[PDB]
Amino acid sequence: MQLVLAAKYIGAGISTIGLLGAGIGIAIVFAALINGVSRNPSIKDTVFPMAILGFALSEATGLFCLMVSFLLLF
Amino acid sequence: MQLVLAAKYIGAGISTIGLLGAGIGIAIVFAALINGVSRNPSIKDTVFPMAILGFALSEATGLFCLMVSFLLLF
Amino acid sequence: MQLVLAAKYIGAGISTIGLLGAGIGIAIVFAALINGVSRNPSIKDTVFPMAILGFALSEATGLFCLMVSFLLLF
Amino acid sequence: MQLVLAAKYIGAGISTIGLLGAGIGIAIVFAALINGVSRNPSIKDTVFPMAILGFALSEATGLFCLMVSFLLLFG
Amino acid sequence: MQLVLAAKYIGAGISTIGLLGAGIGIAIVFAALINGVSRNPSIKDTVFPMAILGFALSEATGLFCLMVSFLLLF
Amino acid sequence: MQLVLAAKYIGAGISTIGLLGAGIGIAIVFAALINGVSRNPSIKDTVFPMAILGFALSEATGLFCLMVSFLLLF
Amino acid sequence: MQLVLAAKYIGAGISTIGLLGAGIGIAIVFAALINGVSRNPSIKDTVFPMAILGFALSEATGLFCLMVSFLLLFG
Amino acid sequence: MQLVLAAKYIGAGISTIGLLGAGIGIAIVFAALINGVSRNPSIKDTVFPMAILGFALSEATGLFCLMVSFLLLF
Amino acid sequence: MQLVLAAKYIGAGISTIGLLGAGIGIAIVFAALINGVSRNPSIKDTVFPMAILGFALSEATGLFCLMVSFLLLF
Amino acid sequence: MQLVLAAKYIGAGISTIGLLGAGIGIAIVFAALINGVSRNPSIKDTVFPMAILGFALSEATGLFCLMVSFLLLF
Amino acid sequence: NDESILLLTFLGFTGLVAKYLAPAYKDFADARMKKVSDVLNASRNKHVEAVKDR
Amino acid sequence: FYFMNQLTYGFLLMITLLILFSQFFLPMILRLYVSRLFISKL
Amino acid sequence: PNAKRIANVVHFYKSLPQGPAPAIKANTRLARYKAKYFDGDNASGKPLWHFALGIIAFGYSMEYYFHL
Amino acid sequence: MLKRFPTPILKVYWPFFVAGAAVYYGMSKAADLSSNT
Amino acid sequence: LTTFSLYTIIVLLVITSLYTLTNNNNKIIGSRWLISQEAIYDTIMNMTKGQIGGKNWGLYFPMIFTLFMFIFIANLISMIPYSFALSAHLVFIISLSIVIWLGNTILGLYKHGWVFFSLFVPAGTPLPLVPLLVIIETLSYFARAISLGLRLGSNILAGHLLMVILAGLTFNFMLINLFTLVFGFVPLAMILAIMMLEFAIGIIQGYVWAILTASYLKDAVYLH
Amino acid sequence: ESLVSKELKDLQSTLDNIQSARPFDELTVDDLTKIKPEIDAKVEEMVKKGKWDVPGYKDRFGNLNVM
């Protein structure tokens, strides 16, 4: 019983890197966003809310990752 | 059998890194969408449903991932 | 004696990442699907059956992965 | 003898996530297939068979993964 | 008893590596930054604020990762 | 001795995810084949062994990893 | 308390490889830097600062990662 | 000593999967081979004898991990 | 006392494999050097100091990984 | 004990998958060399040296890896 | 038996071989045979037509 | 154990196919090559 | 000039008219198998299948020698 | 039946005959030195 | 009597059964059985014509033929179910690989003396890393040897083990209750497409053997 | 003038067989080497040199290979 909280701690340790994908995901949105704009410069109004839409509910996976990490931390 | 809930906890821990794939992929969907409208601005209303369809059903894989994490968590 | 179902649970946890690519790979198909219609909007309804073919069969593997996880759960 | 089957269960656990490769694989196959038919209309019916060759020619590699996870789970 | 702190140690060890993603992610934005200025030099003020935006709010997820690491540490 | 066949079995499990290499690999052999026959339809026979050779090199490297499984499985 | 410096050592070991993020990281910046100067010759001194900026507080991943290890080495 | 052979067994299991490098590498070499020969058609026997060289040099270092899989094990 | 250096050994083992990202890093820098100076051969002395500059201060960071390995070995 | 030699074997197992990135990276060095000189043949004598500059010292760094296994394994 | 199952798969497989490949191989050999016989007849036809020239 | 038996018959058949193919079966087909050539070339 | 015409009249002098020496009747207890199976009309693949039939027996027979 | 053609292999493929006999002899030493395990 | 001795008897009588009974008494028209050997001759001919590409190229052309057909035939014999596999032994195939690799080293040493070790630099490098490459791919120098046979032996062994294990899998899954035959046909068609793959993993791996050792003859024989 | 008195009846009698004596789909290299030893002479000296390449073959007869 003095190990199940220790196992919660180490399971919170390797619940961490599910947002690893978030770390290498939402970022490339901006990569394509620059290729969205530096190719065709008159399109900022079309794609910048489109890119924040693509950002938010792709980061949401990293949110889900670390919130299961927090509730397995506690 | 005080070990089995600890094992549930670590097994739920490394069941949350199966969304690394979702956390990359559902961002590359809108990345290629942004690369799609910036090559042809006239087709915006046809690429948006396709992107959001493959996006949503895509996110459903990471949702299956953390619902496996939930029903393993309890 | 109690190590068996505890190990069942951690084995389902470390098999969860079977659909890891599932989240990605799939996003690549629809990626090219958008990049099949930005450069050529005239051919969409011919290649969208091919794309739902790839998406469906393309995900049939992650389906195999989490049904392995489910029959490992039961 | 109660240690061996629990390790068999975790072994079929770790011997599942090799079809990660197949799930990425047939996906990027169809990605280039759509890039083949998209830039070239009249190539489809020629290279779609080859791609379905390229669709199940490697897909079974990932199957090898879960057949380990069929046998080591069961046998 | 004298085991949960060692569990905290190794759990902070395994939780560290999610900043791989941020360690990748901001880089691709800078890559796209130099793929914006090189093939369209007269764009900078529309893309470089947008690039440092993407930099900050994709680096923040990896910062959440290693702050989870140190809060689990101490 | 009752420990070691179980250790063989989990060693065979962690040995199985090297055919990840072939699964990602032979795909882009076929992908380069299709992107190369697309922009040049009359080189296909001339590039068909050049493709399938590489197929039979990467496929076979997948068949390295699981034979290390099998002489650990037996 | 005899297990614990050992666990600190392997905890340093698993927390070493996040500097994987450095070894890819700044390199792909340099990837584009060469495609920033080969594709456009007279723009080096405009974009080489951005690249070295894209060097410096990128390589932070690596730094932040292994100083974790150092604060598991002494602390 | 009824455990060190279990350890060399799972050491073979974890040192199986360095061939992920080879299973990616020779395939992407031949991928660039196909996408180079279909671009420039009359260079087949000028880049093909070093495509096989790059195959050999990616097999060279995808096989120190296989000889670690052998000489550890036997 | 007969366990701390065992953890040193497997800790050197896990702390080996961060040079995997250092490998690719250096590999590419020169890959973009090829696909830059090939299509543009006049820029070579303009690039190749900077380029090998862009080599050096990457690799050494990967060297950080194995120097960690030596400080975990002696 | 006999645990330290067993831990040596599993350490030599994990410590060999760091040349993974090296085997990927030198392959994309030859990949860029193909797509550079199958664009522009006359530059081969100029870049096939430099590429195989950039090949080799992008590999021995990764082939530090097994050397760190080597002194561990013996 | 275990190996008569591989015999079952092999019977169906060689049946599919005689379904798909062997008629295509047969008519491929037919095409090559017609080509070789036609050019060999045409060479001797031009040869015997050359003798009338003298 | 029995590495010698398979190695013995396998090397005998490797030498057999070397000498056999070389002196017999490749030039019996190159006969047909040069036959069709010196009929058509005339 | 000379050489083609004289090579032709050497080539067309001894060559036999009606495709002579037909050899449509010969036997050595195995060539009848060949003439039914491998000559200019049938050339069917099934004899290799029939040859495979032998191995269909043979390993089975060796199974009949080994385990059964 | 078939016309025997003297095509050269004896003074042509000597290192592979030598290598076959050398692996034969070295493997005979290996199986007469190491086969007692 | 040895089973593998009789398997080599099977090999040689198959090879005698590819030209003699193929011969419709020296008909030049080249019948259906002879077009196959025609095609194999042609497609190895146009392979090694371009690979080594020298004035002395055909001397080894029977060898590059006799290394192929031995592997072309013996890896189509154990496609028969009731048989035992020929190239399954890493002993025998690695033996043949060490034979061919040692033959290449001896041919290259006999042909090019002291400076034969200058194969081991592909092209120009800067000076302070010259010795690097030499030891860089030293495993390939001898790692090449074990790999050339180990590839084909691993393919053969794991494929026949795949066919035996999955035939036993479809056997052992179907001694339980009679509903198991209902939609249990997808493993049967899976093993059937595995046999479709198995003709490929014989023939194309033999072609791999041919092209890799033809590359190795270009390595040893010619000075680049 | 007496040159043509045999040369004219020669080639008409030669074409008299050539329209009537052609076993072209049933020819045999036995009879060929029996009348033309130049075939096996060139084959034998060819392999003794080692010119396995048969020049001038592919342009009128298809190579029929895999690639």
Side-chain angles (χ1 to χ4, degrees), chain K residues 28 32 35-41 52, chain P residues 11 14 22 24-25 27 57 60-64:
Chain K
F28 180 76
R32 179 62 185 174
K35 184 183 290 184
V36 173
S37 177
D38 188 75
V39 66
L40 192 62
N41 195 2
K52 303 174 185 178
Chain P
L11 278 78
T14 307
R22 188 180 293 172
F24 63 100
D25 288 332
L27 190 54
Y57 185 84
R60 77 278 309 276
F61 297 152
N63 52 1
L64 73 100

Side-chain angles (χ1 to χ4, degrees), chain B residues 1-25 27-56 58-74:
Chain B
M1 226 227 268
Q2 190 65 41
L3 192 274
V4 62
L5 67 153
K8 287 172 72 174
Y9 290 155
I10 75 101
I14 28 186
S15 69
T16 64
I17 62 171
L19 54 91
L20 163 54
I24 291 171
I28 83 168
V29 175
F30 291 106
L33 175 63
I34 291 168
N35 285 318
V37 77
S38 59
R39 298 175 70 193
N40 192 356
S42 67
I43 177 165
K44 182 177 177 180
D45 292 329
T46 309
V47 295
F48 191 83
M50 303 169 76
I52 200 165
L53 192 281
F55 161 69
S58 147
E59 246 232 332
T61 66
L63 292 180
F64 283 173
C65 177
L66 87 154
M67 74 91 202
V68 167
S69 174
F70 279 160
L71 64 93
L72 177 60
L73 181 71
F74 292 106

Side-chain angles (χ1 to χ4, degrees), chain O residues 92-119 121-135 137-138 140-221:
Chain O
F92 174 63
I93 299 302
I94 283 170
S95 170
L96 184 55
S97 176
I98 292 168
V99 161
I100 292 170
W101 181 74
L102 283 177
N104 292 320
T105 59
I106 292 301
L107 186 63
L109 283 170
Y110 185 78
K111 197 176 285 289
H112 295 283
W114 293 95
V115 76
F116 176 71
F117 290 97
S118 183
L119 189 156
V121 284
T125 63
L127 190 145
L129 44 89
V130 165
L132 206 33
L133 183 34
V134 207
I135 221 172
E137 79 124 88
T138 27
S140 144
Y141 223 46
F142 59 92
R144 174 179 291 169
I146 52 98
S147 177
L148 174 57
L150 190 144
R151 175 177 292 107
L152 205 152
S154 300
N155 292 311
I156 290 298
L157 175 61
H160 291 289
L161 190 57
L162 178 69
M163 292 187 285
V164 171
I165 280 177
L166 265 74
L169 189 151
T170 57
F171 182 74
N172 293 317
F173 179 64
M174 296 173 70
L175 270 69
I176 68 102
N177 298 109
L178 191 63
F179 293 109
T180 185
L181 194 145
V182 181
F183 53 91
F185 189 80
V186 270
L188 189 68
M190 185 175 72
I191 303 166
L192 179 60
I194 277 166
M195 186 171 286
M196 287 284 284
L197 185 150
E198 189 71 25
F199 276 3
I201 211 70
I203 298 169
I204 305 170
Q205 293 288 325
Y207 187 82
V208 160
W209 182 272
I211 186 68
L212 264 72
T213 190
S215 174
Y216 297 156
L217 263 70
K218 164 157 65 182
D219 296 329
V221 174

